[PDB]
């Protein structure tokens, strides 16, 4: 399957997650957050080694709200966007909705409040892998390829400018 090989090529060096727990699940949620942090930091370290260090993320104390920054390089200019998301109660079976609030209204593949609209292939891809994928995979398989389509379009249309 081309889809199976493309998924493996993108995520094969990201630690797989294990625990089926969401924000209400107490010691099981603390364990799930250990998996999420170990997977995120390995992905960041890999990204630095590949000259593609393209985001930072932090969470609140309980790990229910995430926020940070992503960067997108176009014609050697670096564009920075603030990102944020809440962890759904039914995570990790349900995928979180990444928002890029400063781009709200400016992109057709986007919902009100700046929540990105991914392709219809993303949801069944996440579903088939539960609970192995986490936030590192959402970034690698969801936001990353969305930016590589939507940011070049906004720059070429003159809707955003370099700051």
UniProtKB/Swiss-Prot annotation:
PTM remark: Ufmylated at Lys-123. Deufmylated by UFSP1.
SUPFAM superfamilies linked: UBC-like (SSF54495)
Cross-link Glycyl lysine isopeptide (Lys-Gly) (interchain with G-Cter in UFM1) placement: 123
MF terms in GO: UFM1 conjugating enzyme activity; UFM1 transferase activity
Keyword Ubl conjugation found: yes
GO CC annotation terms, alphabetical: extracellular exosome
Residues at the active site: 117
InterPro entries: UBQ-conjugating_enzyme/RWD (IPR016135), Ufc1 (IPR014806)
GO terms of biological process kind: brain development; protein K69-linked ufmylation; protein ufmylation; regulation of type II interferon production; response to endoplasmic reticulum stress; reticulophagy
Record note on quaternary structure: Interacts with UBA5 (via C-terminus). Interacts with UFL1. Interacts with UFM1. Interacts with KIRREL3.
Domain notes: In absence of UBA5, the active site is solvated by water molecules thereby reducing its nucleophilic activity. A linker region of UBA5 is required to reduce the amount of water molecules in the vicinity of the active site and elevate its nucleophilic activity.
Disorder cited: Neurodevelopmental disorder with spasticity and poor growth: An autosomal recessive disorder apparent soon after birth or in early infancy. NEDSG is characterized by axial hypotonia, delayed psychomotor development, poor feeding, failure to thrive, peripheral spasticity with hyperreflexia, poor overall growth, and microcephaly in most patients. Additional variable features include contractures, facial dysmorphisms, and ocular movement abnormalities.
Similarity section: Belongs to the ubiquitin-conjugating enzyme family. UFC1 subfamily.
Name listed for the protein in its UniProt record: Ubiquitin-fold modifier-conjugating enzyme 1
């Amino acid at each position: 399957s081309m889809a199976d090989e493309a998924t493996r090529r993108v995520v094969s060096e990201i630690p797989v997650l294990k625990t089926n727990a969401g924000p209400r699940d107490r010691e099981l949620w603390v364990q799930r957050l250990k998996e999420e942090y170990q997977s995120l930091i390995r992905y960041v370290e890999n990204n630095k080694n590949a000259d593609n260090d393209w985001f930072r993320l932090e969470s609140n104390k309980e790990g229910t709200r995430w926020f940070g920054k992503c960067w997108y390089i176009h014609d050697l200019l670096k564009y920075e966007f603030d990102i944020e998301f809440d962890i759904p109660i039914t995570y990790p079976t349900t995928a979180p909705e990444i928002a890029v609030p400063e781009l709200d209204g400016k992109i057709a593949k986007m919902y009100r409040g700046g929540k990105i609209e991914l392709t219809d292939h993303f949801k069944p891809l996440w579903a088939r892998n539960v609970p192995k994928f986490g936030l590192a995979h959402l970034m690698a398989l969801g936001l990353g390829p969305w930016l590589a389509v939507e940011i070049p379009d906004l720059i070429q249309k003159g809707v955003i400018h370099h700051k």
